[PDB]
Swiss-Prot record:
Changing P199A: Normal CO(2) hydrase activity, but impaired stability. It is found in: Cytoplasm; Cell membrane. Target of drugs used in treatments against glaucoma disorder and breast cancer. This is Carbonic anhydrase 2. Gene3D superfamilies: Alpha carbonic anhydrase. The keyword Lyase applies. The gene is CA2. The record marks Y5, N60, N65 as: Fine-tunes the proton-transfer properties of H-64. The modification Phosphoserine is found at S163, S170. Its EC number is 4.2.1.1, 4.2.1.69. Changing Y5F: Enhanced activity.
Length: 258
């Protein structure tokens, strides 16, 4: 009886196995744009993904992850509210059963159809495992998805989902360029938070982009065909794999723009 997104093992139940769920810096949160503080000292984000090397795509029962080779500084994030270099290890999405919900973070209570999370770890800690033991060990770049025009750069991902329909399945996924998933502007909001799935560790510096990317109804529909279940068990569609907004507590959201 492990964690999930169902009525008996959903987000409201996570605190029993992961007490940190009721912690001081949990994510996601609602971004109140009028209370966010413009910080002139925040430097522009530096995204260097030209040398990225994707390796595999897999269904882990909660979402699907596209993993990258992080043995060298091939795809890194620098600048912004960050000190040092952060290496990209994987990206995944959270989505809903309908176009009106799916994102984890909200903007003035508005929910988007999905949210993309590019996960990076601080290279000064040597590896991901060590990074998750530090308060500044991870940096997650969050991008909202709205339904409208199709995103060409996302198609290669949607076309392989059929091969990893059930939990545990994985497939080679090389030469995928994540630059095709980025919006025009890099304006962002940032705040200290946590991973949005167990273990819910509080080691994340969140960088949420203000500009969402558009994807087509057909593309998001393919996400909804995945299964939470594995093997040959009762089919349970992988939808609404998002966590509700958490208390901001003693935290301030900063904006790179005004
Ligand atoms: Hg941590
Ligand atoms: Zn996530």
């Amino acid at each position: 009886h492990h964690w999930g997104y169902g009525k008996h093992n959903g987000p409201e139940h996570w605190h029993k196995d992961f007490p940190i769920a009721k912690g001081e810096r949990q994510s996601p949160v609602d971004i109140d744009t009028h209370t966010a503080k413009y910080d002139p000292s925040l430097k522009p984000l530096s995204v260097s993904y030209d040398q990225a090397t994707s390796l595999r795509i897999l269904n882990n029962g909660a979402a699907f992850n596209v993993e990258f080779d992080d043995s060298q500084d091939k795809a890194v994030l620098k600048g912004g509210p960050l000190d040092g270099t952060y290496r990209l290890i994987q990206f995944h999405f959270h989505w809903g059963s309908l176009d009106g919900q799916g994102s984890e973070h909200t903007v003035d209570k508005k929910k988007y159809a999905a949210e993309l999370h590019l996960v990076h770890w601080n290279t000064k800690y040597g590896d991901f495992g060590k990074a998750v033991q530090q308060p500044d060990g991870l940096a997650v770049l969050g991008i909202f998805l709205k339904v409208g025009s199709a995103k060409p750069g996302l198609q290669k991902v949607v076309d392989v989902l059929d091969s990893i329909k059930t939990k545990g399945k994985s497939a080679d996924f090389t030469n995928f360029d994540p630059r095709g998933l980025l919006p025009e502007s890099l304006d962002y909001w940032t705040y200290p938070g946590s991973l949005t799935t167990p273990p819910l560790l509080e080691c994340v510096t969140w960088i949420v982009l203000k500009e969402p990317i558009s994807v087509s109804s057909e593309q998001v529909l393919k996400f909804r065909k995945l299964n939470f279940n594995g093997e040959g068990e009762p089919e349970e569609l992988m939808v609404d794999n998002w966590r509700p907004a958490q208390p901001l507590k003693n935290r301030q959201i900063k904006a790179s723009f005004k």
